[PDB]
Amino acid sequence: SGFRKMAFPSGKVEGCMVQVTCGTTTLNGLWLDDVVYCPRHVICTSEDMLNPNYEDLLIRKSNHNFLVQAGNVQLRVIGHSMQNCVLKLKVDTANPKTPKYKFVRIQPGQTFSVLACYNGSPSGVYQCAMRPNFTIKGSFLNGSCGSVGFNIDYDCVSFCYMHHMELPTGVHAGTDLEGNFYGPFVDRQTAQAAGTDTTITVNVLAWLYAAVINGDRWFLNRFTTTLNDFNLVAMKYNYEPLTQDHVDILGPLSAQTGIAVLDMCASLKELLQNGMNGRTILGSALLEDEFTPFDVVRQCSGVTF
């Protein structure tokens, strides 16, 4: 029993974190095979971050301008290229700790583990979700840039996020490992705002199933709803629309608990209109939306990596 916000074991990713220094700027890099990936803004100065021409800033750099440190060992940079907003520093040594990996771009609602790093050194691991507004509500300080988001599927680390910046509201913006930003963000010091966020409905339902699996049934009721009437209620409370795909994904949890997906929607509908009434679900007074249906199954079945 028990349900916690749980991250993947970060060991495979820790053995990839390196420190990248370019001038006075220090951030993190991800060393996979003979390449180090890091945010391209590492080459910006104070005047540059305001309106940077990265092609022009990069052309002025030599390989030796990039100090890459893996622990206490300086890695030799033998090449440098840019792919979208990520800088790829070709190094003389292939990382002997390179796990089986893939670069995957995730969709809003999907969760991943973040290995927060400072000066190429992992300091913490947390689980978070790609918000529908494409930001992550992370925990990052100065120097965390280059810290990565990942999942593990079997023996393979799927890298899905690289941290780049913090928006004025305290939320974070980043890219996939191919340098494409999630969301309508750009890598420059300019006025940028996160769009109004919405709740990840399929994830709330998955978390309600996790609460039932853990013995919390107070919120259940005899009622059901149509998928259409639920989306009409959900749109009112800034919830993401629930699709037939989401209903199908919740199938195994519905089968395990004996509560049809539309039966759990009527519970969620009642919780949105009436509230929790002083009660808690899994030790929370809010409807938690950062556990996917797969996260619930993984944690309630003990899949190992």
Ligand X SMILES: CC(C)Oc1ccc(N(C(=O)c2c[nH]cn2)[C@@H](C(=O)NCCc2cccc(F)c2)c2cccnc2)cc1
Q: Which residues bind a copy of itself (CB under 8 A)?
A: 1-12, 14-15, 115-119, 121-128, 137-141, 143-144, 166, 170-172, 214-215, 280, 283-286, 298-305
Catalytic option among 16, 22, 38, 41: 41
Q: Which of 11, 21, 25, 137 binds Cl ion (CB under 5 A)?
A: 25
Q: Which does 75 bind (CB under 5 to 8 A by kind): a copy of itself, Cl ion, ligand X, none?
A: none
Closest distance between a copy of itself and the C-beta of residue 139, in Å?
Answer: 4
* Residue in the shown chain whose Cβ atom is closest to Cl ion: 23
Q: Which residue has the tokens 């409905």?
A: 201
Closest distance between Cl ion and the C-beta of residue 21, in Å?
Answer: 9
Contacting residues for 225 by C-beta, under 8 A, at least 6 apart: 233, 262, 265, 266, 269
Terminal-residue alpha carbon distance, the chain: 20
Catalytic option among 117, 145, 160, 265: 145
Residue whose C-alpha is closest to residue 264's, from 210, 215, 301, 300:
210
Give the interface with ligand X as residue ranges (CB under 6 A): 25, 27, 41, 44, 49, 140-145, 165-167, 187-189, 192
Give the tokens for residue 9.
Answer: 């074991």
Q: Which does 119 bind (CB under 5 to 8 A by kind): ligand X, Cl ion, a copy of itself, none?
A: a copy of itself
Residue whose C-alpha is closest to residue 142's, from 117, 115, 113:
117
Q: Which of 9, 23, 71, 170 binds Cl ion (CB under 5 A)?
A: 23
Closest distance between ligand X and the C-beta of residue 173, in Å?
Answer: 8
DSSP 57-91: HHHT--GGGEEEEETTEEEPEEEEEEETTEEEEEE
State the Cα–Cα distance between residues 99 and 282, nearest whole angstrom.
35
- Catalytic residue status for 41: yes
- Catalytic residue status for 145: yes
Q: Which does 103 bind (CB under 5 to 8 A by kind): a copy of itself, ligand X, Cl ion, none?
A: none
Pairing of β 17-22 and β 25-32: antiparallel
